[PDB]
Amino acid sequence: SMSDPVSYTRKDSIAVISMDDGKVNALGPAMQQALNAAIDNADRDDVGALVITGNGRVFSGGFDLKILTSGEVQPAIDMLRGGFELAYRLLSYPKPVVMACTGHAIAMGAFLLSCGDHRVAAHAYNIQANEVAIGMTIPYAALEIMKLRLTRSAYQQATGLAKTFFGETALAAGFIDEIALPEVVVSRAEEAAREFAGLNQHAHAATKLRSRADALTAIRAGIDGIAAEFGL
Amino acid sequence: SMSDPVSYTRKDSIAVISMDDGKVNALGPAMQQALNAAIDNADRDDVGALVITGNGRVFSGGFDLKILTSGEVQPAIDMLRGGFELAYRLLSYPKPVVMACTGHAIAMGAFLLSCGDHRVAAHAYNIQANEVAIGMTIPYAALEIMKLRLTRSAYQQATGLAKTFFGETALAAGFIDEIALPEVVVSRAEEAAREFAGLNQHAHAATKLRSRADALTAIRAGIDGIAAEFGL
Amino acid sequence: SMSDPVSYTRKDSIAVISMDDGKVNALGPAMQQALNAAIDNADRDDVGALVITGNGRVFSGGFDLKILTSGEVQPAIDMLRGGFELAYRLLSYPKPVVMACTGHAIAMGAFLLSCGDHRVAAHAYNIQANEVAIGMTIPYAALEIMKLRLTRSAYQQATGLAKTFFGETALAAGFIDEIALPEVVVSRAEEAAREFAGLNQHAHAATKLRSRADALTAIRAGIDGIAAEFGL
Ligand SMILES: CCC[C@H](O)CC(=O)SCCNC(=O)CCNC(=O)[C@H](O)C(C)(C)COP(=O)([O-])OP(=O)([O-])OC[C@H]1O[C@@H](n2cnc3c(N)ncnc32)[C@H](O)[C@@H]1OP(=O)([O-])[O-]
Numbered sequence: 001s002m003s004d005p006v007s008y009t010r011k012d013s014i015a016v017i018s019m020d021d022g023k024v025n026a027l028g029p030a031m032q033q034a035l036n037a038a039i040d041n042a043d044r045d046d047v048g049a050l051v052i053t054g055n056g057r058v059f060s061g062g063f064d065l066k067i068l069t070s071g072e073v074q075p076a077i078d079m080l081r082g083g084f085e086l087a088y089r090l091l092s093y094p095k096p097v098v099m100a101c102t103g104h105a106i107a108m109g110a111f112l113l114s115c116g117d118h119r120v121a122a123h124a125y126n127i128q129a130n131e132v133a134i135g136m137t138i139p140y141a142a143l144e145i146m147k148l149r150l151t152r153s154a155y156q157q158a159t160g161l162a163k164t165f166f167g168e169t170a171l172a173a174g175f176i177d178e179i180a181l182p183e184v185v186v187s188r189a190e191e192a193a194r195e196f197a198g199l200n201q202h203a204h205a206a207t208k209l210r211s212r213a214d215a216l217t218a219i220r221a222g223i224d225g226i227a228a229e230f231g232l
Numbered sequence: 233s234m235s236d237p238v239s240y241t242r243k244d245s246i247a248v249i250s251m252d253d254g255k256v257n258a259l260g261p262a263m264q265q266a267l268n269a270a271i272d273n274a275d276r277d278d279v280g281a282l283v284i285t286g287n288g289r290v291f292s293g294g295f296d297l298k299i300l301t302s303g304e305v306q307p308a309i310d311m312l313r314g315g316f317e318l319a320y321r322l323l324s325y326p327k328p329v330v331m332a333c334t335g336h337a338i339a340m341g342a343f344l345l346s347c348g349d350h351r352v353a354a355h356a357y358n359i360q361a362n363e364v365a366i367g368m369t370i371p372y373a374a375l376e377i378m379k380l381r382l383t384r385s386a387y388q389q390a391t392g393l394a395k396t397f398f399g400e401t402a403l404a405a406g407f408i409d410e411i412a413l414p415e416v417v418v419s420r421a422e423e424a425a426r427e428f429a430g431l432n433q434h435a436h437a438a439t440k441l442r443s444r445a446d447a448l449t450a451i452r453a454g455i456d457g458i459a460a461e462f463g464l
Numbered sequence: 465s466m467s468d469p470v471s472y473t474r475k476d477s478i479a480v481i482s483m484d485d486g487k488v489n490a491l492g493p494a495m496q497q498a499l500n501a502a503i504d505n506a507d508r509d510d511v512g513a514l515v516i517t518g519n520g521r522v523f524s525g526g527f528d529l530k531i532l533t534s535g536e537v538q539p540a541i542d543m544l545r546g547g548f549e550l551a552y553r554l555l556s557y558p559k560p561v562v563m564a565c566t567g568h569a570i571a572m573g574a575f576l577l578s579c580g581d582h583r584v585a586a587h588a589y590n591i592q593a594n595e596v597a598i599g600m601t602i603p604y605a606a607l608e609i610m611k612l613r614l615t616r617s618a619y620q621q622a623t624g625l626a627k628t629f630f631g632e633t634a635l636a637a638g639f640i641d642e643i644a645l646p647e648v649v650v651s652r653a654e655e656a657a658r659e660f661a662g663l664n665q666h667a668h669a670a671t672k673l674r675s676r677a678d679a680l681t682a683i684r685a686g687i688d689g690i691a692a693e694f695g696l
Pocket residue numbers: 023024026057058060061062063064065066068080104106107108130131134136137138139142
């Protein structure tokens with residue numbers, strides 16, 4: 001539901017966090033708060049791993065366009081900061097995080113997707129930073145998230161050319177780690193999550209931070225520089 | 233012709249710049265001036281995108297070997313600086329740049345190729361930094377251009393081992409973005425160019441600079457350090 | 465033999481260095497000294513290229529676990545420093561280095577493997593940094609070695625998730641450069657070595673250092689920071 005856009009379900013060693021706002025899982029304030037609250041729940045349950053899913057229509061269509069373009073600056077800035085804060089939180093999360101990309105992932109939807117330790121999508125799901133196509137420059141925080149995962153040549157095209165990836169081209173590019181049929185995307189993500197929960201948690205938490213140190217520092221800077229993007 | 237080695241042709245939303253010196257499109261002073269002048273023309277026409285092609289024999293065989301090895305130092309330095317200046321100009325160009333790799337691309341030919349936003353080649357076209365094979369160390373400016381596009385492992389082999397890439401291995405390595413049959417390489421490049429011209433120009437110009445900032449800074453330094461390569 | 469775990473054989477333009485301790489080629493002090501001594505021999509013979517092989521069972525199972533977990537700190541530190549010193553030496557070696565991955569390569573075995581200019585393995589050979597699986601954080605020196613070769617997304621999974629790679633997935637990830645049938649892994653490595661020996665040696669030595677400068681600096685730092693890993 002739009003009022004209640006996130007569900008949380010503990011399954012033995014994992015927690016499944018599912019976005020469904022009835023529409024395209026826009027990452028506005030309500031959605032961000034719902035996600036953060038679900039993660040707090042996973043912290044409380046001390047689960048072995050997280051799965052985050054979209055709905056049957058998309059993973060996420062990104063930030064809420066209504067807020068972004070209402071003509072009020074501070075709320076748009078605040079929505080942007082919160083989205084990238086959440087990305088930071090997922091990239092630094094001390095448990096394995098698996099993304100079940102259950103539909104298209106556009107812009108912030110794709111940036112959020114790129115925060116998972118393991119990412120599962122179906123062959124025909126579009127993954128795209130479409131900013132340049134719609135006349136926006138890609139924020140530094142988003143650039144750093146993408147640069148952490150996309151091959152050097154895919155990064156060039158994904159950014160400057162707003163290239164759309166899917167299936168095998170998304171896998172080769174580093175926009176996803178696993179392809180599965182639509183009807184088993186979630187099951188495959190849960191399966192992967194259960195396996196990762198068997199890894200040593202301390203070693204995983206510590207190693208992932210080392211493998212992402214420079215990106216996380218650059219993302220923190222990008223979050224604090226969001227206002228400057230606007231020139232504000 | 234060798235005297236007139238570059239043609240410029242505006243086609244609606246794109247400009248097609250074609251190298252043909254009657255030979256292997258050596259990137260000597262005349263060729264560099266011809267290319268720069270054609271780009272100035274594209275600036276004047278305010279086109280949506282550029283396509284740059286080679287001839288039916290090669291994309292380019294790289295710098296003019298006659299000048300490089302004549303035994304006169306300053307002209308060789310000046311040719312090298314101009315080639316990498318042109319590369320800098322293409323990597324920072326505010327319109328999408330599509331390379332039609334119409335034949336082999338060796339050394340500076342491959343470095344020039346790697347300056348396109350989108351690069352199209354045929355299956356059997358060799359793309360290779362052959363410096364190490366012929367007893368030269370790869371200039372820092374060239375290393376940075378390659379590092380911007382080649383995967384980490386392909387970069388290692390392309391440089392130290394002068395590895396030759398083509399077709400699928402060039403695509404996987406990040407030496408090209410698209411493979412096409414020889415007879416449609418140019419058509420595919422033009423088609424891609426027309427599509428990219430539909431992107432928001434300001435957003436594209438700004439985003440590509442962000443996606444290349446560190447490389448461009450390192451390339452500027454490499455251009456100013458060309459003389460030092462010789463130990464001069 | 466365990467007492468005599470390394471053989472050295474000059475073949476025309478190449479030297480073949482073969483690990484076989486009768487077991488899993490554990491990289492303890494004896495093995496490290498044997499390897500260094502074999503390399504000194506290659507220096508003396510001034511060969512064109514090196515091939516390093518494992519045995520019929522593995523490339524290497526990594527550091528000696530007996531020493532690592534005996535409960536004596538300084539010998540474990542010293543073994544670790546020596547392994548990464550040897551890696552530094554191979555990455556900076558002035559002749560082409562080809563690894564014949566003749567069996568599985570785990571942890572330091574995989575890090576050692578990643579020091580070759582060209583790496584050949586068979587389809588079913590597991591290559592894995594398994595540290596996180598067994599509750600250890602990956603040392604910075606090892607992280608830098610891996611980051612030099614693994615694609616951005618493969619690096620994430622190889623480290624934080626202790627992902628196992630093999631065959632095509634290892635090739636795509638950048639854990640190897642060539643796949644061959646088990647019975648010709650060594651022959652293919654020797655063949656590649658002979659070809660690389662035909663490259664200009666000075667240009668190769670100089671170019672590989674440039675292509676690895678930042679990694680080598682970070683690896684030197686990681687070697688000098690091994691004691692700190694323990695918190696010692
Ligand atoms: C400045 C830096 C910021 C950062 O970089 C990102 C920016 O946001 S730039 C990136 C900017 N993002 C984009 O330019 C495009 C993002 N969206 C899309 O690409 C497609 O809509 C999507 C593939 C998600 C769904 O395709 P589909 O399945 O064919 O469905 P559909 O297309 O017919 O739309 C369905 C309904 O949902 C609505 N709606 C859609 N998106 C949003 C949104 N972000 N928010 C709110 N609503 C959104 C839409 O209005 C419609 O509502 P209604 O009243 O019921 O008709």
